Amino acid sequence: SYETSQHNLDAVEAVLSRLQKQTGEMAAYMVPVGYRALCVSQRESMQALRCSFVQGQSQPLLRGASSKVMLAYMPAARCEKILRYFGEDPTLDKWQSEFEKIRRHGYAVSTSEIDPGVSGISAPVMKGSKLIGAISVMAPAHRVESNKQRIILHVLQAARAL
């Protein structure tokens, strides 16, 4: 359980519940742990979506909107260590341009980086200047294509509420 380790799980659960009722999509709260993104709380799909994000399990902090938001908002030194572990060169424009874009917008969007046909939209959860986690919606590209601005606004709204 993350009852004693996630200080604000009640608040997180309330935000994710609303977010799914606003978008009709799966939503999760992710936190960075070393080289990986841990899914701490997840709503679960009322459709039949079976993607790689599972509550209590982690993914490498590298691909997808959630990973890219956390990498963009954590300290540079930390971000560099992680990307170098995965064999990426953090100094390249393809990374630096993405992080600048993310910080300008306040969220990231990804498509099919993890699961073919599934997109991610994510925004950082901050405590002051410290990145603590991210709120994300994981949803079929079929639906994101019709609801992109709606999902972005609600994801931003969810993250800001925490």
Residues that bind Cl ion (CB under 5 A): 64, 110, 113-114, 120, 142
Which residue, 82 or 114, is less far from Cl ion as judged by CB? 114
Q: Measured from the CB of residue 68, what is the shortest distance to Cl ion in angstroms?
A: 9
Q: Of 6 and 64, which CB lies nearer to Cl ion in the complex structure?
A: 64
CB of 33 to Cl ion, least distance (A): 19
Shortest Å, Cβ 30 to Cl ion: 13
Q: Which is nearer to Cl ion, 109 or 156 (CB)?
A: 109
Whether the Cβ atoms of residue 30 and residue 16 lie closer than 8 Å to each other:
no
User: In what order do the strands lie in the sheet containing 108-111?
Assistant: 58-60, 36-42, 26-33, 130-140, 118-127, 108-111
